[model samples]
Structure formats: C-alpha cells, structure tokens
Target: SKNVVIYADGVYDMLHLGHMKQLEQAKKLFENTTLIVGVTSDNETKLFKGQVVQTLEERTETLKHIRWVDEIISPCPWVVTPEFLEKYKIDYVAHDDIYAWLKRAGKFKATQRTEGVSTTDLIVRILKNYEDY
Candidate 1:
C-alpha cells in the first residue's frame, strides 16, 4: 500500500480515550500511514490562540506518550492551508464527528467514529467552578 498520510490536531493539553480512538483509526487506514498531530505550541498558543491554561512542557510531554501518533507539529490556526496540505501530501484531515459534519458532506476523505474521549468535556469537568478563565 502507498504511504498514506493523515493530519489531525488540537491542543491535546489533556489527552484522553477519544484521542486514542482517533489516532487508532488513522493508523488503521493505511499500512504506511503517518499520524500527524499538530499540538498548540507555547508561543503560538500565547500569541494567536490565547492564554493556554496548561504549560508547554506538560502538553508536549503528554503527546509524546501516545504511541499512536507518528509525529507532532505546532498547531497553525485551525485550518490547514493549501500549501501545508500539498507540502505534506496529506491524504486527509481528521476532525471529530461532531465538528466535521459539514466537511464530510461530499468528500470520501472524511473519517467517522463510533466513540472515544473528549478533550473539551474532560477539561471542563476538571475545571468546573475553578474559574481558570
């Protein structure tokens, strides 16, 4: 099989089961597939994104523990530019089922899922009433 490449991203500040499932599916798609996780870097996060609650080291090290992810890059906005997509030869960009509804309409590129962890929900649950914002 050809070396298929799939790119997905997020802060992944708090890795969870959902992340695992997504990565697993991406890995399962092709024998020579590469799972590219674009994590929100410290500088970028602070500059454009906003104040990230988690420290840079914490987010970086957490992603390193995921065996499913082949490589990790810094997050660039939320959209993948044409240049980046072409440069990487990315076959697909993976987003959760909830967020990808519109994009999945006419594309064979969209990947679906049955279930998995939710980084946002998990974070909200943990930070409830903490007033971190």
Candidate 2:
C-alpha cells in the first residue's frame, strides 16, 4: 500500500538550515509522502507571533515551490486540528508533540523536535550588525 506523510512547520520565511534538516528528516520517514506546510496566516501570525515577518503569500509561495513539498495549507489559525488532518487525507502527521491533538493521530510516524536555529535570533543579529536600515 502507498504511504502518505504530512509535515507542518512554521515561518520558513528565510529558509534556515534547521528547517531544511527537519524537512529532510520528515521526507525520510515515509513513501508517497505529501508535505503540507501549515503557514500561520497574517492575522494569526500577528496575534501569536506578534509580527508577520513575511506576507502569507510569500511564505506560501516559498513552501509551494520546494521540491519536497507537495502542498501548502494556510490560515493555520492556532494549531493543527483533526478536521484539517482528515481533510488533507494525511496518513502521517509529523510535528512536535506541541500540536497535542495531531500528536495522537493513529497514523503518526516521526517527529523531529529540534533546537538552536531561530528567526528572532537571526533578526536580532542582523539588526545588531547593521543599524543603518
């Protein structure tokens, strides 16, 4: 039987190494997999992340163009929901347990909860070094 794996991650605005590694790990977990990046919407990002560093379209487009990514879901709202999983026909939902509910999906495969790389830190570094802008 063919297998399908779904992966959802955040931002991806600047495309960091950590994100790439996560995608790599996610791709390795299953066959006939489809990656659906749940990009936080503009309003949602402002509500939670405090700022929409990149327009929702820009983020969505970036993910859609990725060779590994099969599709991109949006308006992620707050977190992943069972309905969304079902709607996408996602066989395996890959994410840190933080999604909680999605974590319980029977079709679970692997979750790569990593650390170190961060957009905030990157922004801070840029601002610190170049104050002219």
Candidate 3:
C-alpha cells in the first residue's frame, strides 16, 4: 500500500467541469493518491445512467487526457460492494451520491454534489447565449 487508491465513477455524456471537479477532488484526497475513474458502459448508461450521448470510447478517451486520472475501470458496477473494493484494492470510493452500501462501511467519501452545473450549465448557456439555436 504505497498509495491510497481512490475510485470515482460516472457517465460522462459530454465531460464537463462538474465531472472534472469530481476527478480533481478525488486525486487531491490523499497525498500521492491513485485516482481510478470507472466509466459506465454504453449499455449500462442507458439502463441506469440516462442517455449515452457519446460512445463509450468517446467518454473514455476524454477521461484519459485528464491529469488527475491514474487508471480507469469500464463496465463497472452501478453499485459497488465490499468485494468490488477488495478486488480493485480501492482505498476509498469518492462520489457525491452517497451509495448506502459504501457509506455503511465507512468507505464513501462525499464530494460537493455539482448537479447544478452538471445538469443545466450547457442548457443555460444555449438559452442565454445562443438562444437555444
């Protein structure tokens, strides 16, 4: 255990700052942290995480360039479990959504939820700036 492994998972439809903030905070959680980003597969995205506006490759590629990401897990579980954490050697799960399972185990690290930015920033921009095309 040379470094703490922090996991951050999401469906990055367009890969905006809200998503980046999640990554940014996780990487900064501990000194010398290893941030593992888990991206939902396209199939998984539709089943639970809403639309897959971008292809899995597209989403994954965008995450690849982010400096904070140390590794990535795809087709990841929507709900993480003890065994999942054990399997991946994840020290802590970083997310805004407080998944009860992880929280009960005291494994979840809460970040400020940025749904305000995530959900409406682009829409607001189009409405205010471009007048919605």
Candidate 4:
C-alpha cells in the first residue's frame, strides 16, 4: 500500500463521540495513511463558533489521545495555506469551509460527519438540562 498523509481539521471543541468519529473517518479513508489533525484556538472558536467548553491546549491534547490522529497542527490557521500543505507534507485536505482551494486542486477528502451529533447540540442539551424546571 502506498503511504499517504491526510490532514483533517476542525474546531474540535467539547470532545465527544462525534468528534472521535470524524477523526476515525478521516483516518479510515486511507489504508496506509498518516492522519494529521488541526486544532483551533479558544479565541478563534470563541469568535467564530461561539463558546468553547475546553481550552486550546486541552483540545489539542485531547485529540492527541485519539487513536486516529498521528500528528497535529496544534493551533492551526483559520484558513488553510499552501505553506501549511508544504510544511505538513499534506496529501489531502479533509472537510469543508476555507477548503475550496484544496478541492479545486483535487486535494480534498470529504468526511460525512456523524449525523445529529455536534458540540452545539451538546451545549443546547446541557443548558436545557441545567435550566430551572
């Protein structure tokens, strides 16, 4: 099998089964693959995706423990860059948002994320559970 280096990135906040599944899917996409994950910072997630339940350092380390992740971009850019691809030796860029260029260049791999599971869903449920009844 040919060796492959695939990069899958996301906010990856509030660790959950869904997040793990995404990682798994990305890695599982290739037989002989090195899956590199990108973890966004608290500031970016806070600004763009709203509240993040965990710190950047915490999220990065959390992903590090997951079985599928081989390397990490550790506080990766909000937007993917050619420099990043070259720096990481990335063969494929996984997932959407700011990845249109990768798709254009035939370097994108899609992960059909775990349906009906998300950090936002978790947040909503937890908030509702804690609300006065």
| Tens digit of per-residue lDDT, candidate 1, span 48-105 | 6676767766876787788888887754446556567677777777765434533653
Clash totals, every prediction: 1, 0, 0, 0
Q: Please give, for residues 1-133, the per-residue lDDT of candidate 4 as tens digits.
A: 9989999888787778888988888898879999989888778878887887788888887788899999998888877888889988899987745667888888998887786687678778888867586
* TM value for model 4: 0.84
**C-alpha displacement of 3 in model 3, angstroms?**
1.4
- For lDDT, candidate 2 versus 3, the one ahead is 3
How many backbone clashes are present in model 4?
0
Kindly provide the TM-score of model 2 when superposed on the true structure, using C-alpha atoms: 0.73
How high is the lDDT of residue 33 in model 3?
A: 90
- Could you list the CA RMSD of all candidates, in the order they appear? 6.0, 3.9, 2.9, 2.7
Q: Native-vs-model 2 lDDT?
A: 0.68
Model 3 CA lDDT for position 95: 84
Task: Please provide, for model 3 over 6-55, each residue's C-alpha lDDT reduced to its tens digit, 9 standing for 90 to 100.
Answer: 99888877888888887899899888898999988888779875767888
Candidate 3, TM-score vs. the true structure? 0.84
Q: What is the TM-score ranking, best to worst?
A: 3, 4, 2, 1
Error of 1 at 48 (Å): 7.8
Q: Write down the RMSD of candidate 2 (Cα, Å).
A: 3.9
